[PDB]
Swiss-Prot record:
It comes from Homo sapiens. A fatty acid binds at residues 128-130. Forms a beta-barrel structure that accommodates hydrophobic ligands in its interior. The modification Phosphoserine is found at residue 14. The lineage of its organism: Eukaryota, Metazoa, Chordata, Craniata, Vertebrata. This is Fatty acid-binding protein, adipocyte.
Length: 133
């Protein structure tokens, strides 16, 4: 019953400062412009200890499966090759990505009927709000 309130199909309904977050990450112009248009569906499921998060979008489809606390390889939508670790901290899913001596953290939490995603790189935060699809 780990992560029950996250499970389901979610649609992006608002974004703030995502271009600035991508700039801070190092994303190039053309990827920022095209990726910034996308309104992905995020599909979250749990089977035993394995959590799967899929992102279906007109930009790029991605999928990760993981066990909490156990590092894994991830290729991000912008084609970074990162080492990721995802934990639960007080009911918030905390996803840290490490690559090229850099780090970014993505937090996902349930707030009312929304799933709120906060993406932080250095001093820049982007907030991405999802509703049930
Ligand atoms: O709502 C979101 N939920 C996530 O986990 C995000 C998935 O996309 C990445 C991303 C970073 C840089 C460039 C591109 Br293209 C994508 O940012 C995090 S956005």
């Amino acid at each position: 019953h780990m992560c029950d309130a996250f499970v389901g199909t979610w649609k992006l309904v608002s974004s703030e400062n995502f271009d600035d977050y991508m700039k801070e990450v190092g994303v190039g112009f053309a990827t920022r412009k095209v990726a910034g248009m996308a309104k992905p569906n995020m599909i979250i499921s749990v089977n035993g200890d394995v959590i799967t998060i899929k992102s279906e979008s007109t930009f790029k489809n991605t999928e990760i499966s993981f066990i909490l606390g156990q590092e894994f390889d991830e290729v991000t939508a912008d084609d970074r090759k990162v080492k990721s670790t995802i934990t639960l901290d007080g009911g918030v899913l905390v996803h840290v990505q490490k690559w090229d001596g850099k780090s970014t953290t993505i937090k996902r939490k349930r707030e009312d009927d929304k799933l709120v995603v906060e993406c932080v790189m250095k001093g820049v935060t982007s907030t991405r709000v999802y509703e049930r699809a």
